[PDB]
Write a protein that binds this ligand. Sequence first.
Ligand SMILES: O=C(O)C[C@@H](c1ccc(Cl)cc1)c1cc[nH]c(=O)c1
Length: 289
Amino acid sequence: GRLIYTAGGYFRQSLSYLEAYNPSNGSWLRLADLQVPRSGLAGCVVGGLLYAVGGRNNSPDGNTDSSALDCYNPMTNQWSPCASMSVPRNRIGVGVIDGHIYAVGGSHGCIHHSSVERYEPERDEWHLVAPMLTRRIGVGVAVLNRLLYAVGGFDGTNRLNSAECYYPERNEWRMITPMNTIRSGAGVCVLHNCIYAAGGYDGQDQLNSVERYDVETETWTFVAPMRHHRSALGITVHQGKIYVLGGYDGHTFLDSVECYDPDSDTWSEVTRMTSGRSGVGVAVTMEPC
Ligand SMILES: O=C(O)C[C@@H](c1ccc(Cl)cc1)c1cc[nH]c(=O)c1
């Protein structure tokens, strides 16, 4: 069976936790800590391995943006460092295409990146690709039909409803239809033929609204809202359902986990994380041993 892995996050300071939730039985396991605390990171999986990408260590003894890529092997319960990115990227988004990891946007101090780079596991090497048309931190990233999408974020001045698509064989970005809502630090994922954007921050409020982009019609449509307003949430897909983990609602660092059933267009509470946190990295792979 497969588990939902949550890595890092923020509560009072950046966190090192790696914990795994099993939808099939409701259990949480605490696994090997990250070597360096980090919030604002992203998670992804390639070849059954879990990767933690970017972020920032907000700590008593200083604040350090991360260029790190680290690899967790469920078979061994060990973290291993990989090649670092060209630049530190806090509040990063990532997507996987054809076994390669794309790192998108994020911040380094007051620098808000439009740059994008691609990691090749078989070479342990990062290479820059074409930059996005827009600087985006707190950017949502998803992959559909071997195309990469960057959705919302913050450009250093404004939070964004805009979104864009990267065509690998052209090494080019093009704008798509903007969302109906400004969202920085939404959760963005794919399910069936649609890109979903859940929650986020519009500069005033954390959001409970959820909308989805149909690549065939090029239009965004709202679906049922989440039960909890949240920005800086983690999101993933497990067996055809969207799960959202944690985040911030302007009052509380949430422990709430919700899942979305697209067939009934309903959100339900599923479990609580062991402690409230925002800015986690989340992905799905095999249980450890
Ligand atoms: O829009 C912003 O400036 C960044 C945004 C954010 C924070 C964490 C992450 Cl991981 C992703 C996005 C944010 C800021 C303040 N309050 C928010 O609720 C949300």
